[PDB]
Amino acid sequence: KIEEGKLVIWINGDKGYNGLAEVGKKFEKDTGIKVTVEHPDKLEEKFPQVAATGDGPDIIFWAHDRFGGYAQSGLLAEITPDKAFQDKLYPFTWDAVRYNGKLIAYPIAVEALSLIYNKDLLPNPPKTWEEIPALDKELKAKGKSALMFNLQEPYFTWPLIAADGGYAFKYENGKYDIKDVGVDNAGAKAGLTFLVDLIKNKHMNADTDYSIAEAAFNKGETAMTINGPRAWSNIDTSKVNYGVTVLPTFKGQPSKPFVGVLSAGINAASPNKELAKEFLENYLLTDEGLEAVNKDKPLGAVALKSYEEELAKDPRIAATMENAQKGEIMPNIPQMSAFWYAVRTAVINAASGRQTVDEALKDAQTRITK
């Protein structure tokens, strides 16, 4: 079982665990309670196993979407922040950590795709998707293209498909309706049709994947790309003069990227729930706590309003948050696995003309509501 009188934390190795350890030393300094930060391999797979037998960490950090399944098995304790604490974070981040009306984690950081552009090839980035075909024509006249991004993964193409009314599952009051899916409505067909037109008209290649898009942008061959905070590091080494901005609108509607919220959940089997609540609310979720983590490895945009206002002095963070506020929180329900699979197939089939847009989306919708 889990030991009383200490805190064990699991967080992924690509996060600022040395910075989190420093927040834990301040907590120990104040309380005498020792905090241990670990970053085990495949911790998101291990957690459900060890937590099922009342073991594991007191606190686990992960993207909010995995927590729906954890909470389904009763592996997470319901949290109880007061209204005053809740107000210190962006309201939309709390929606990401509700499972069947219960708050099951604390929101830490927010991730969403943004439009990344080469300031040298483009003085001002396009504000709409519709003007991209013409812009590509101007740039092709000089051996460059307008836009290259990963078309193989629905995570990347979804912002455009959803822009005019598409949605994964309907959400109402901390709950999703698994029978109300917006994959084959008029808005989703409009968006995927637009995407297919870009491919037919040779403004983009259907086989463009993550590594192809990144290489082209970082080599200066394409004016724009669509990517998240994790990409900036390779661009910075490439020394391309880039900007990060709000995604283009489609049909006058904002692009709707999926929002991922890094969250901290408390093991239901933990005998240290009060200690975990004190650590999270009063040590980690402060400007000083988040700064310590961020200084180790940047979090991106954060759910804490006060610290986010300081971070947003960096335009790339500001844009990340702006796209997140216009985005679609990623559903934390198990049915999302049917969605990823079906939509990946629908997009690839419609892109290669194997199937028409109507038929590909019709099939996906059926398959997801099955």
From Swiss-Prot:
Protein location: Periplasm
GO function term, MF aspect, one: carbohydrate transmembrane transporter activity
KW Ribosomal protein (keyword) present: no
Coiled-coil blocks: none
Keywords carried by this UniProt record: Periplasm, Signal, Sugar transport, Transport
Keyword Kinase appears in the UniProt entry: no
Cystine connections: none
A single GO cellular-component term on record: ATP-binding cassette (ABC) transporter complex, substrate-binding subunit-containing
Subunit structure: The complex is composed of two ATP-binding proteins (MalK), two transmembrane proteins (MalG and MalF) and a solute-binding protein (MalE).
Protein name, per record: Maltose/maltodextrin-binding periplasmic protein
Protein species of origin: Escherichia coli (strain K12)
Source species taxonomy: Bacteria, Pseudomonadati, Pseudomonadota, Gammaproteobacteria, Enterobacterales
Gene this protein is translated from: malE
